Structure formats: C-alpha cells, structure tokens
C-alpha cells in the first residue's frame, strides 16, 4: 500500500492520506481517514486541528482583477487531533494503525464523515484568459496548529491538500430511454408522430450514442431538417438558483420527410471536450489543480432525496427536434417544430 503525502512550507506539519478520490455510493461516502505528523520541536501552540471543507470557488464579474477568486463554505467539519479531549475516543482504522506504527505517536489520527446529499467535486471550465484557481465545487483538507478556533491561521503553520468526492456508473443499467410525441395541426386531423430512443441508458465518457429516430408524417407539412443534440444540464444552487442547457454534441441532418410518408434513421454522436473548449462555465469533473478533466459526469441523487442540494447538479439529455415547414393559413407566425428529449447517464465505470 501507498499513501499520499504533502508537507507545509516549513516542514513542521505533514498530512497523510490513503487516497485522494473518496467514492460516494449515495448511501455512504468513503471516510477521510489519515494522520498528521507534528514534531514536538515545532509544537509551541499545543493544539493541532484538521478541517474538511466543501467550498464553491467563483469569480465576481464586477471586479476586473483578472484571476481573483472567492470561496463560499457549503459544508465544514472540525476534528481536534491534539490534545485528545477525554470526551472523544475513536477506534483507529486499519489504515490509521499502520501509519502510527510507521511514523509514531507524533502522527495524530483524524477521520471525517461526509454526509449524504452533498455535491460532488465539479469544476467549471475556465476560459483561455483565466489565470486564477479552479472555479466550482472542490473538497479540501487543511491541517494547522493554533491556540484556539478564534486565532488567525498562519499560512506557514498550515498545509492544504485537495481531495475529490466522486461517483461511478450504476452496476445495473437503467431502462432504455424512449420517448414519443404526436403533434396535430388545425388544418386537418392528420398527426405528425415522432419516436426516438437511445441504444442504452448508461454511457461511458467518450462513447458513441446511437439515436434511433422514426417519424410518421401524415400532415400536409414537410420536415425540412432534423437536429439531434446531446445537451449538458447544470443546476447550480448557492444563492438562489441558476441553470443552463448547453449542446456538447450535435448534428443538423437535412433528412426530409415528405407529406404522407414515414422515415427511419439512426444517428450517432459522441461528446468530447476538444470541440467544446470555448464554452466558458461548462461543467467538468473535479480538478486537483489545473489538469484536463473530461466532461462533468452526471451526478446521481438519492430517490427520496432532500432536494435543493448545494453546489452543481449536472445531468444529460438528447434532444431530437424536427424543423417543420410552417406557412399556410397562418403564415410563418405559428411555430410547427416538434421536439422530444431523452435523458441518460454519463459517467465512468466503477474501477475494480
């Protein structure tokens, strides 16, 4: 086994952890267990704390500093590693008891429990003209020594390591996404039936999505074009609520469906980040510093969820639109386009 290690600027504190990515199984989150090595030679305050922080990092638009960022703590937890207060005695994990043995009594254990219905680590895509730190939701464990919780923490007597709350594809695949819609126009009782379905419910990052379309046009109108588009939804709930839909993959096929005739075709799209770099704010999976990460994985909420969950809640849907001729009695005033949507799960398979 191997553990991650990071020391403070002057080397008096050193944080140890078994892993960076702590999986969220919906029903439980992997606990953040580790130790903090502090030599007595440098321990003068005689109080070492460890803190887990889930904060949303953002930039203010009015301010033109070019890189300035701010944090807003969504969830924060505290564990007094030293001195061990008599009203807190916890059993060390296998991981922890291996570490003390290796290092010694100067390595004080800490263990945090991430509660359910908290956001996963999601970083919003920065533009090319963005030099600050990564914006979005990110988890951070910060160890420091201070006389009390009131005192101001010195950056040299402290060390911060970034960690990620992640999720993976369900082991059981969900039901095949299928959706239908029928539009009836006033000119006559002839309907325009649109039927669409995806190949599977779960899709891994960078995999092809096949859309089986079947249009049955009995109307006097003609389908000029067919626009398929994989769209990324992102519900952001911090101070009031924002949301957006953005096409990460699309295709504008000029397949015509003449009046009183059927049509059937399979379209294949594949979302990838290269042809989406210019989309500032596009949700991406959590970044430790500034590496390239894939498109944000769909976040899985509980069934009987609490709702109004903080952070960023990303989803995906495939929209199948039909651009219809319009005209006639009403002219081009009334819209005749018919569209239907198909939700699907996009995320990484569980690593073994």
């Amino acid at each position, epitope marked *: 086994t*191997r553990v991650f290690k990071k020391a403070s600027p002057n080397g008096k504190l050193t944080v140890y952890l078994g892993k960076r990515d702590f999986v969220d199984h919906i029903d439980l989150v992997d606990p953040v267990d580790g130790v903090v090595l502090v030599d007595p030679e440098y321990l003068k305050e005689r109080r070492v704390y460890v803190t887990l922080t889930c904060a949303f990092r953002y930039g203010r638009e009015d301010l033109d500093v070019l890189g300035l960022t701010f944090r807003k703590d969504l969830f924060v937890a505290n564990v007094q590693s030293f001195p061990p207060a008599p009203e807190d005695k916890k059993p060390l994990t296998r991981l922890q008891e291996r570490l003390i043995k290796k290092l010694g009594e100067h390595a004080y254990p800490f263990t945090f429990e991430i509660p359910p219905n908290l956001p996963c680590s999601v970083t919003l895509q920065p533009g090319p003209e963005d030099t600050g730190k990564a914006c979005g939701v990110d988890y951070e464990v910060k160890a420091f020594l201070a006389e009390n919780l009131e005192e101001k923490i010195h950056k040299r007597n402290s060390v911060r390591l970034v960690i990620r709350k992640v999720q993976y594809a369900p082991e059981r695949p969900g039901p095949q996404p299928t959706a239908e819609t029928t539009r009836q126009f006033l000119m006559s009782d002839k309907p325009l039936h649109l039927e669409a379905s995806l190949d599977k419910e779960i899709y*891994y*990052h*960078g*995999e*092809p999505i096949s859309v089986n379309v079947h249009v049955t046009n009995n109307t006097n109108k003609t389908v000029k074009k067919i626009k398929i588009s994989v769209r990324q939804y992102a519900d952001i709930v911090l101070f009031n609520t924002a949301q957006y839909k953005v096409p990460v993959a699309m295709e504008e096929a000029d397949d015509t469906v003449a009046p009183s005739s059927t049509f059937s075709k399979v379209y294949t799209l*594949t979302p*990838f*980040l*290269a*042809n989406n770099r210019e989309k500032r704010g596009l949700a991406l999976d959590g970044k430790l510093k500034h590496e*390239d990460t*894939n498109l944000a994985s769909s976040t899985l909420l509980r069934e009987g969820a609490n709702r109004e969950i903080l952070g960023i809640i990303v989803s995906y849907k495939v929209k199948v639109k039909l651009v219809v001729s319009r005209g006639g009695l009403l002219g081009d005033l009334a819209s005749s386009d018919v569209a239907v949507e198909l939700p699907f799960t996009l995320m*990484h398979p569980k690593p073994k």
Partner: antibody
Amino acid sequence: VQLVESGGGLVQPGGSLRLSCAASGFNVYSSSIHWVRQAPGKGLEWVASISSYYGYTYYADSVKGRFTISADTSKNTAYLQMNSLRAEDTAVYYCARSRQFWYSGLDYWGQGTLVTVSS
Amino acid sequence: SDIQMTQSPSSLSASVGDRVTITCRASQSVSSAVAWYQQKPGKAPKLLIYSASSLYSGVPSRFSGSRSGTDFTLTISSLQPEDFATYYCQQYKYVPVTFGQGTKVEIKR
C-alpha cells in the same frame, strides 16, 4: 478487436512515407492511439501519441518537427506522416491502443509494418 | 534529460517450473506507473502488468509485480512453456514513456 498497419516500404533518406492504423472494436474518443519504433534487436522506443478526446499531439524530442500524428475519427484510422526520413528511423513501427479513462499501459498492439530507409 | 529504464538482468536462464524475477530501476521517482511486456520473436508485444502491481485481464495468475522505491520487479511462481520470451519494463508517469533494454528468458537444457 484489431489494429491493422499499412504503408511500409523502402524510401531514400530525406524522403517521406505515411502510415495508417485502422481500428476495430475501439471507440476513437475513448482511446489514445500510439506509435512505437523498434529496430531489429534494439528495443522499443516511443515516437508519437494522439489523444482524440482532448485533441492533443505528443512527440519524442528526436521526432519533434519531423513527423506528424493525425487521425480520421470517421474512418477510425490513425495516420503518421514521416518527413525528412533518416537511416536511424529504419524499424518495424507498431500501433498501440491505450485507454483514455485512464491510461493503464498499452493493452493492444498491431503486427507492425516494416519501414526501411536507405539510399 | 529523460527518464530511462534499466533492467538489471541481461539474459536469464531457467528450467520449466522456476521462480524467475526481473528487476528494473527507473532513473527517478515515477510513482506506481510502471508496466511489463512480453515479446516473442516476430510478434508484437503483449501487456502483462500495469500500475506496477495490478494484473491485466486475460494474463495468467502466475505473473505478479511489486514496487520498491525506484525498483520494480516482475515475478512468476511457476515457469511454463508459454513464458519463454523477452521482457520489457515501462514507465508512464511523464512523457516521453521509455522502455528497458530487455531480458532474454530461455529454456534450460
């Protein structure tokens, strides 16, 4: 699943030659195609790599400026244009797939086409 | 100015049923990002082990790897007629990814 190489032969020094690697059973955007060079009895050497999901190219310093790695996603084939060729570059060139999420070695290789450079 | 891989053996000889170990020490700390390959004459290489210790799918359970600072080792519990070929150690933390010289494994007689 398979990787089919093509485009090998004899070319004089300074000339050019282009390789093709057709893929089957591998999604282009969930993979990263690689190129490896081995002379007879000399060992393996990485020369180039293409990441089609992020859209990035990588080359060994020896090859920087001389070769160029490309790929037609629609045709599921990865090409390598080799310009200003040299006798050093005489070798069997292998094509190797890699998992994009995430790199766990070079799980599959092709038989490799014989490339020979000499006057 | 690149990370090179040095396989400690040159040519290993052993009979069928032996426990063979191939050591490979990298130039600097490449973390647990190391792999091993097998190349028969006239054939392309096959991936054996990745992530220093993790075994690849379809590879027999006899092969196993282990990390030790900069030294990474490939091991086999019992040696079989299918295992007689050359071996290569790889690293893939930083680019360029480099390979070892090679260890000629052969049947004892």
